[PDB]
Design an enzyme around this catalytic site. Structure first.
Site, PDB file in Angstrom:
ATOM      1  N   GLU A 202       0.835  -1.197   0.000  1.00  0.00           N
ATOM      2  CA  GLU A 202       0.000   0.000   0.000  1.00  0.00           C
ATOM      3  C   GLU A 202       0.872   1.251   0.000  1.00  0.00           C
ATOM      4  O   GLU A 202       1.826   1.337   0.773  1.00  0.00           O
ATOM      5  CB  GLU A 202      -0.947   0.031   1.201  1.00  0.00           C
ATOM      6  CG  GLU A 202      -1.959   1.177   1.115  1.00  0.00           C
ATOM      7  CD  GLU A 202      -2.795   1.345   2.367  1.00  0.00           C
ATOM      8  OE1 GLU A 202      -2.708   0.488   3.268  1.00  0.00           O
ATOM      9  OE2 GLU A 202      -3.543   2.343   2.451  1.00  0.00           O
TER      10      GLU A 202
ATOM     11  N   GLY B  38       3.207   2.248  10.747  1.00  0.00           N
ATOM     12  CA  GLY B  38       2.963   1.582  12.013  1.00  0.00           C
ATOM     13  C   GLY B  38       2.616   0.120  11.817  1.00  0.00           C
ATOM     14  O   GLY B  38       3.198  -0.760  12.446  1.00  0.00           O
ATOM     15  N   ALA B  39       1.660  -0.136  10.935  1.00  0.00           N
ATOM     16  CA  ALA B  39       1.226  -1.495  10.652  1.00  0.00           C
ATOM     17  C   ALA B  39       0.436  -1.525   9.354  1.00  0.00           C
ATOM     18  O   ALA B  39       0.052  -0.477   8.834  1.00  0.00           O
ATOM     19  CB  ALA B  39       0.396  -2.041  11.801  1.00  0.00           C
ATOM     20  N   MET B  40       0.196  -2.725   8.836  1.00  0.00           N
ATOM     21  CA  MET B  40      -0.464  -2.885   7.545  1.00  0.00           C
ATOM     22  C   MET B  40      -1.519  -3.982   7.591  1.00  0.00           C
ATOM     23  O   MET B  40      -1.258  -5.085   8.066  1.00  0.00           O
ATOM     24  CB  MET B  40       0.569  -3.190   6.460  1.00  0.00           C
ATOM     25  CG  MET B  40      -0.033  -3.350   5.085  1.00  0.00           C
ATOM     26  SD  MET B  40      -1.021  -1.769   4.553  1.00  0.00           S
ATOM     27  CE  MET B  40      -2.421  -2.649   3.517  1.00  0.00           C
ATOM     28  N   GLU B  41      -2.699  -3.675   7.061  1.00  0.00           N
ATOM     29  CA  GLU B  41      -3.873  -4.528   7.230  1.00  0.00           C
ATOM     30  C   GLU B  41      -4.046  -5.597   6.154  1.00  0.00           C
ATOM     31  O   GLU B  41      -5.177  -5.930   5.799  1.00  0.00           O
ATOM     32  CB  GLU B  41      -5.138  -3.662   7.267  1.00  0.00           C
ATOM     33  CG  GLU B  41      -5.495  -2.980   5.938  1.00  0.00           C
ATOM     34  CD  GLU B  41      -5.003  -1.550   5.844  1.00  0.00           C
ATOM     35  OE1 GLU B  41      -4.014  -1.201   6.529  1.00  0.00           O
ATOM     36  OE2 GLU B  41      -5.613  -0.770   5.078  1.00  0.00           O
ATOM     37  N   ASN B  42      -2.947  -6.135   5.632  1.00  0.00           N
ATOM     38  CA  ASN B  42      -3.044  -7.145   4.578  1.00  0.00           C
ATOM     39  C   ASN B  42      -3.928  -8.296   5.052  1.00  0.00           C
ATOM     40  O   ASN B  42      -3.795  -8.762   6.186  1.00  0.00           O
ATOM     41  CB  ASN B  42      -1.666  -7.672   4.176  1.00  0.00           C
ATOM     42  CG  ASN B  42      -0.616  -6.584   4.106  1.00  0.00           C
ATOM     43  OD1 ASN B  42       0.269  -6.508   4.957  1.00  0.00           O
ATOM     44  ND2 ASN B  42      -0.704  -5.740   3.086  1.00  0.00           N
TER      45      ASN B  42
ATOM     46  N   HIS C 217      -6.857  -1.346  15.379  1.00  0.00           N
ATOM     47  CA  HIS C 217      -6.962  -0.632  14.110  1.00  0.00           C
ATOM     48  C   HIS C 217      -6.816  -1.566  12.913  1.00  0.00           C
ATOM     49  O   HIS C 217      -7.680  -1.598  12.035  1.00  0.00           O
ATOM     50  CB  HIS C 217      -5.901   0.470  14.042  1.00  0.00           C
ATOM     51  CG  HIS C 217      -5.908   1.240  12.761  1.00  0.00           C
ATOM     52  ND1 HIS C 217      -6.525   2.465  12.631  1.00  0.00           N
ATOM     53  CD2 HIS C 217      -5.362   0.966  11.551  1.00  0.00           C
ATOM     54  CE1 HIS C 217      -6.366   2.909  11.399  1.00  0.00           C
ATOM     55  NE2 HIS C 217      -5.664   2.017  10.722  1.00  0.00           N
ATOM     56  N   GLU C 218      -5.729  -2.329  12.881  1.00  0.00           N
ATOM     57  CA  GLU C 218      -5.461  -3.203  11.745  1.00  0.00           C
ATOM     58  C   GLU C 218      -6.521  -4.295  11.620  1.00  0.00           C
ATOM     59  O   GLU C 218      -6.870  -4.696  10.513  1.00  0.00           O
ATOM     60  CB  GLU C 218      -4.072  -3.839  11.854  1.00  0.00           C
ATOM     61  CG  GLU C 218      -2.918  -2.847  11.939  1.00  0.00           C
ATOM     62  CD  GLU C 218      -2.978  -1.768  10.874  1.00  0.00           C
ATOM     63  OE1 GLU C 218      -3.390  -2.070   9.734  1.00  0.00           O
ATOM     64  OE2 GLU C 218      -2.615  -0.612  11.180  1.00  0.00           O
TER      65      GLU C 218
ATOM     66  N   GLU D  47      -9.540   4.863   6.318  1.00  0.00           N
ATOM     67  CA  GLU D  47      -8.639   5.323   7.375  1.00  0.00           C
ATOM     68  C   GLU D  47      -9.348   6.185   8.421  1.00  0.00           C
ATOM     69  O   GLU D  47      -9.138   6.004   9.618  1.00  0.00           O
ATOM     70  CB  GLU D  47      -7.464   6.103   6.779  1.00  0.00           C
ATOM     71  CG  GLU D  47      -6.528   5.282   5.891  1.00  0.00           C
ATOM     72  CD  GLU D  47      -5.934   4.072   6.599  1.00  0.00           C
ATOM     73  OE1 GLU D  47      -5.947   4.032   7.848  1.00  0.00           O
ATOM     74  OE2 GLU D  47      -5.452   3.155   5.902  1.00  0.00           O
TER      75      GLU D  47
HETATM   76  C1  LIG Z   1       0.399   2.609   4.270  1.00  0.00           C
HETATM   77  C2  LIG Z   1      -0.085   1.575   5.263  1.00  0.00           C
HETATM   78  C3  LIG Z   1       1.055   0.756   5.826  1.00  0.00           C
HETATM   79  C4  LIG Z   1      -0.888   2.197   6.385  1.00  0.00           C
HETATM   80  C5  LIG Z   1      -2.022   1.292   6.810  1.00  0.00           C
HETATM   81  N1  LIG Z   1      -3.086   1.376   5.868  1.00  0.00           N
HETATM   82  P1  LIG Z   1      -2.627   1.792   8.446  1.00  0.00           P
HETATM   83  O1  LIG Z   1      -3.334   3.118   8.327  1.00  0.00           O
HETATM   84  O2  LIG Z   1      -3.598   0.754   8.954  1.00  0.00           O
HETATM   85  O3  LIG Z   1      -1.471   1.927   9.406  1.00  0.00           O
HETATM   86 ZN   LIG Z   2      -5.277   2.020   8.719  1.00  0.00          ZN
END
Ligand SMILES: CC(C)C[C@H](N)P(=O)(O)O
Ligand SMILES: [Zn+2]
Length: 864
Positions: free
Chosen positions: A114, A254-258, A290-291, A313
Site C-alpha cells: 500500500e 505503524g502497521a499494515m492490514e493485509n 486498528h489493523e 482510514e
Molecule cells: C500505508 C499503510 C502501511 C498504512 C495502513 N493502511 P494503516 O493506516 O492501517 O497503518
Molecule cells: Zn489504517
C-alpha cells in the site's frame, strides 16, 4: 504529472484471478505471475504498471508484442474475450531500501504494497478498484526460509530433494493489489485462538524473531479483545479460520492490514513492563485493534481510488478510538485524541500542505497518509455518530455493508449510507470531505428576557487548493452553568434538557435557549463536537468556573488550556517590552486547586497540568520567532515548577503510594505513573540538583520502563554531566533491545541542552543507529527537527543539518525524507531572517539531481 479525482475512469480491464509464483534465491527472487484478464472495454490497450526487472511477458502462452516505457507496460493487441497474461520479473530484495515492494530485513523477506508497491514486485493493474482472487506459491531454501507466508489459507506444500520446500496460499476473497503480502524467513511463532460468535475457531499466529517472542503477549490479548469488541459493538465477525501477524523492525509506517496477514512495525506489537512504557502498551492496543478493524472497513469494503483513502482510514481510526475508549478511560483518551489533532493536524490545515479529507489531486499518494486524512477523517466520521446517535450510526454501518460488501467505493457512498439508512439529508455534510482548513467559530452570548441568546458565525479560510468555502454543517454541543457552577436547564427546541446539540448550517445563526431564570456561563463545543476553532469572550473568572465545575471533560480541559495560552501571551508581551514576568495570579490559583483536588481522576489531572505546545501558541501568527515563543513557554513552566515545588513532591509521593508497586501495565496504575512523571518533570526543572539524588537511587526507581523513561525525560534538558551518564548507562543496559534504543536516540535528539546538535551528530555514528531504519531516523532526526530551540537556531545550523539529512535519506527512502522535509512547513510564517535560511535550505534540496517525487511535491507546496 498530477493525478486528479475529476479524471477518474473505471478500468478497461478486470483481473479475475492472480496466480503468483515466488522463487527465492540468493540474491535474486524470481516472480512468475498468471493473470486471468477480462475485458471491460473491448479493443483498448492493456496497460500494466511495473518497475521490476522484466524478464518475459506472454499472452496465452505466446510471447507478447509489447512496449515497456517508464514504469508502464503496454500490449496493444489483446483478445476480445478472457485471456491469460504471464509476466516474469526479477527482484533484488536486499537492495530495496525504500521498504516498499519486496525487501529484506533482519535476513528475512517482507512486503509492503500500500498504496502502490505491488507494481514493484510484478507488472499489474495496480489500483484498488481492480480486485482479484489471489493464489500464491512460494519456493525457497528450507533452512534459511522455514516460514513462508501469504494471504489466506495454506492449501498445499511439499519438499524438494535439494533442500528447498514450497507452500501454496489461497485467499478466497477478491482484493486489490495493495492488500497483498508475502513473508519469507526464519521466524518464531506464537499461537492462540479466538472463537467467533457463531462458534468458529480462528487460529491466531504471531510471527517474530526468536528473541522478541516473549514480548508479543499483550498484542495477542489485544487482538482477541478487538475481535470480541467488533462483534459486540458493530456485529462484525471475522471471515477466515486463520489470522496472522508478523513483526518487522524495518517498516515505514505503524502497521499494515493485509488480509489475514497483517505486518506490524515492532513498536506496535512488542512490549513488556521492563522495556515498554504504558503509552507503548496503549499504542499496541490501538494499532492491533486498528489493523483488525480494517478487515471490514478497508478490506471487505475497499477504496475506489486513493483520493478516497479517508474512507477506510478515517472510519478505522474512529473505530480504534471507540475500541480504546470502551476498554478504559474514555474521557481522558478523548482529550488525548483531541490534543493530537490540534497539535499536529491544525498546523497542517493552516500550512502550505493543507488539503481536504478527500483530496482533489496528488502527485505522490504516499504524501497523503496524513493527520488530515486520518485524525480529522475520524472527527468527520465521529460527527455522523454525533448527529445520528449510536443506533442511527449502526444503521448506517449495516446499510453500508449491505450495499458495498466486496466493492471499491467512495466517501460519497459512505455518506449516502448514513443518510439513506436514517432518512436524513446530508448533502451539506459533503463539504467536510471537499473543503480544507479549520473552520473558525465566532460566538456571542446574550441573556435578554429569560432566554440565553447564542449567536454563532462560522468562517472557513482559503487554502492553497481552494479559495471559495461555503458554510458547513457544524454540530455545537452546549450546556449552561450558573454562578455556583451547577447545570442550568433550558428549552430547545420544545424540549427541556440540560444539554443540546446546536446545528450550525450557515454563515451566521442565533440559537434561542429559553426558560433560563438566572445568570449563566455557557459551556461550548462539549466533547469537541466538531473540529473547529471556537472564540468566545470568556473572562478569566469564567474559565476558572468552567474548569472547576463543568460536567464535560473537554470543556474543563479547554478552560485550563485557555488560561495557559493567555499566560504565555502575557509572557510574550513582557519579555518583548523588556519587563518583569506577569504574576499569573488567577492561573496559579487554578493550578493550586487542580493539584490539591483529590477528586480529579489521576490521568485527567495530568492533562490539566499540561501546557500547550509552541505550535499551538503561535497558531495564526505571522513573522514568527519560534525561540521567543519557546522562551515564553519555558518561562511559564519555570514559574509553575518553582512556585509549586513542594506540592510537586507531595503529589509525587501520593502517586507513588497509590501505584502500590503495581508495575505491570494497567489503565489504573498507568494513570498514577503518568501523574508521577508530570511531577518529576516540574521538580527537576525547579531543582536540577535533584538529579543526583535520583541517580543515587536509580535502580530502586527503575521498576519499569515508564519510570525510567519518565525520569530520563525529566532530566533530559539538565546541563549536568549526570544527565549524559544516565543516558549512556541506559544505552548500555538496553543495547540489545532496538525499540529501547529508539528511546535513547529520541532523548538525544530532543534535549533542550545547549550541545544537542553535536550529540546528535555523534549519535549518527552510534553502532546501534542506522539511518536506513525508519524508526531510528525518526527517533534521532525527527526529534531534532521538532526540537524548537535547536531546529530554529538563529545561525541556521538546525536548518542546514535537517536539509542535509532530507537529501541524504531521499537517496534510498523518499517516504521518510518527504515526512522529514515537512519540518520546514512553517517557512513562510517565519520572521525574515529564519525564513530566508529555510528558503535557502529548500532551494538546496530542490537542486538535487534525482530528487524524489515525494519530496519534490512537498518542497513545491512550500516554495511555490
Ligand atoms: C500505508 C499503510 C502501511 C498504512 C495502513 N493502511 P494503516 O493506516 O492501517 O497503518
Ligand atoms: Zn489504517
Amino acid at each position: 504529472t498530477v493525478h486528479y479525482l475529476k479524471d477518474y475512469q473505471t478500468p478497461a480491464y478486470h483481473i479475475l484471478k492472480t496466480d503468483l509464483h515466488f522463487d527465492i534465491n540468493e540474491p535474486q527472487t524470481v516472480v512468475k505471475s498468471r493473470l486471468t484478464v477480462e475485458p471491460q472495454r473491448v479493443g483498448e490497450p492493456l496497460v500494466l504498471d511495473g518497475s521490476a526487472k522484466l524478464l518475459s511477458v506472454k499472452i496465452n502462452g505466446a510471447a507478447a508484442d509489447y512496449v515497456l516505457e517508464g514504469e508502464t507496460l503496454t500490449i496493444a493487441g489483446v483478445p476480445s474475450e478472457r485471456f491469460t497474461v504471464e509476466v516474469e520479473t526479477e527482484i533484488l530484495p536486499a537492495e530495496n531500501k525504500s521498504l516498499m515492494g519486496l525487501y529484506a530485513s533482519g535476513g528475512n523477506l517482507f512486503t509492503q504494497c500500500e498504496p502502490e508497491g505491488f507494481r514493484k514486485i510484478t507488472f499489474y493493474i495496480d489500483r484498488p478498484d481492480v480486485m482479484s482472487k489471489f493464489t500464491t506459491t512460494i519456493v525457497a531454501d528450507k533452512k534459511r526460509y522455514p516460514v513462508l507466508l501469504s494471504n489466506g489459507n495454506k492449501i498445499d506444500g511439499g519438499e524438494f530433494s535439494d533442500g528447498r520446500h514450497w507452500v501454496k496460499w489461497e485467499d478466497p476473497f477478491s482484493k486489490p493489489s495493495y492488500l497483498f503480502a508475502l513473508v519469507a524467513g526464519d521466524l518464531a511463532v506464537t499461537e492462540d485462538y479466538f472463537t467467533t460468535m457463531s462458534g468458529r475457531n480462528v487460529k491466531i499466529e504471531f510471527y517474530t524473531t526468536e528473541a522478541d517472542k516473549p514480548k508479543v503477549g499483550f498484542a495477542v490479548e489485544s487482538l482477541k479483545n478487538a475481535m470480541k469488541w467488533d462483534e459486540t459493538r458493530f456485529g462484525l465477525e471475522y471471515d477466515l479460520d486463520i489470522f496472522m501477524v508478523v513483526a518487522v523492525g524495518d517498516f515505514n509506517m505503524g502497521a499494515m492490514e493485509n488480509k489475514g496477514l497483517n505486518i506490524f512495525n515492532t513498536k506496535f506489537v512488542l512490549a513488556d513492563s521492563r522495556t515498554a512504557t504504558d503509552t507503548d502498551f496503549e499504542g499496541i492496543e490501538s494499532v492491533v485493534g486498528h489493523e483488525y478493524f480494517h478487515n471490514w472497513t478497508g478490506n471487505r469494503v475497499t477504496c475506489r481510488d486513493w483520493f478516497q483513502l479517508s474512507l477506510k482510514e478515517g472510519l478505522t481510526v474512529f473505530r480504534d478510538q471507540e475500541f480504546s475508549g470502551d476498554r478504559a478511560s474514555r474521557a481522558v483518551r478523548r482529550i488525548e485524541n483531541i490534543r493530537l489533532l490540534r497539535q499536529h493536524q491544525f498546523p497542517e490545515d493552516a500550512g502550505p500542505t493543507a488539503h481536504p479529507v478527500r483530496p482533489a489531486s496528488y502527485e505522490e499518494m504516499n504524501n497523503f497518509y496524513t493527520m488530515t486524512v486520518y485524525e480529522k477523517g475520524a472527527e468527520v466520521v465521529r460527527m455522523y455518530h454525533t448527529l445520528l446517535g449510536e443506533e442511527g450510526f449502526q444503521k448506517g454501518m449495516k446499510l453500508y455493508f449491505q450495499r458495498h460488501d466486496g466493492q471499491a467505493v467512495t466517501c460519497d457512498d459512505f455518506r449516502a449510507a448514513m443518510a439513506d439508512a436514517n432518512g436524513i439529508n446530508l448533502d451539506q455534510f459533503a463539504l467536510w470531505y471537499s473543503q480544507a482548513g479549520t473552520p473558525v467559530l465566532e460566538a456571542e452570548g446574550r441573556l435578554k428576557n429569560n432566554i440565553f441568546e447564542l449567536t454563532v458565525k462560522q468562517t472557513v479560510p482559503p487554502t492553497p487548493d481552494m479559495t471559495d468555502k461555503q458554510p458547513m454543517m457544524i454540530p455545537v454541543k452546549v450546556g449552561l452553568l450558573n454562578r455556583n457552577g451547577e447545570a442550568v436547564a433550558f428549552d430547545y427546541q420544545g424540549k427541556r434538557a440540560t444539554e443540546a446539540v446546536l446545528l450550525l448550517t450557515e454563515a451566521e445563526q442565533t440559537f434561542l435557549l429559553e426558560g433560563v431564570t438566572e445568570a449563566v456561563v455557557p459551556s461550548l463545543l462539549r466533547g469537541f463536537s466538531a473540529p473547529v476553532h471556537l472564540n468566545y469572550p470568556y473572562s478569566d473568572d469564567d474559565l476558572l468556573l468552567l474548569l472547576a465545575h463543568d460536567s464535560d471533560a473537554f470543556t474543563r480541559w479547554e478552560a485550563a488550556q485557555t488560561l495557559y495560552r493567555r499566560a504565555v501571551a502575557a509572557n510574550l508581551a513582557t519579555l518583548s517590552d523588556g519587563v518583569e514576568l506577569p504574576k499569573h495570579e488567577k492561573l496559579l490559583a487554578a493550578v493550586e486547586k487542580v493539584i490539591s483536588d483529590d477528586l480529579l481522576d489521576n490521568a485527567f489531572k495530568a492533562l490539566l497540568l499540561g501546557v500547550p505546545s509552541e505550535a499551538e501558541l503561535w497558531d495564526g501568527a505571522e513573522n514568527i520567532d519560534p525561540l521567543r515563543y519557546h522562551q515564553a513557554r519555558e518561562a511559564l513552566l519555570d514559574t509553575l515548577a518553582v512556585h509549586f515545588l513542594p506540592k510537586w513532591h507531595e503529589l509525587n509521593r501520593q502517586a507513588a503510594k497509590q501505584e502500590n508497586q503495581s508495575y505491570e501495565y494497567s489503565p489504573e496504575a498507568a494513570g498514577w505513573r503518568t501523574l508521577r512523571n508530570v511531577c518529576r518533570a516540574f521538580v527537576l526543572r525547579a531543582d536540577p540538583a535533584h538529579i543526583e539524588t535520583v541517580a543515587e537511587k536509580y535502580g530502586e526507581m527503575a521498576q519499569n520502563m515508564t519510570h525510567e523513561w519518565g525520569i530520563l525525560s525529566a532530566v533530559n534538558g539538565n546541563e549536568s554531566d549526570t544527565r549524559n551518564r544516565l543516558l549512556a548507562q541506559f544505552a548500555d543496559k538496553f543495547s540489545d533491545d532496538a525499540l529501547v534504543m529508539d528511546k535513547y536516540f529520541a532523548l538525544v535528539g530532543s534535549s533542550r541542552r545547549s550541545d544537542t546538535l553535536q550529540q546528535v551528530r555523534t549519535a549518527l555514528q552510534h553502532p546501534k543507529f542506522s539511518l536506513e531504519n525508519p524508526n531510528k531516523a525518526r527517533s534521532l532526526i525527527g526529534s531534532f527537527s521538532r526540537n524548537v530551540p535547536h531546529f530554529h537556531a538563529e545561525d541556521g545550523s538546525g536548518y542546514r543539518f535537517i536539509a542535509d539529512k532530507v537529501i541524504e535519506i531521499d537517496r534510498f527512502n523518499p517516504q521518510v525524507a518527504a515526512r522529514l522535509v515537512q519540518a520546514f512547513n512553517l517557512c513562510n510564517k517565519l520572521e525574515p531572517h529564519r525564513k530566508n535560511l529555510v528558503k535557502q535550505a529548500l532551494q538546496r534540496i530542490r537542486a538535487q539531481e534525482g530528487l524524489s517525487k515525494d519530496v519534490g511535491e512537498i518542497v513545491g507546496k512550500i516554495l511555490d
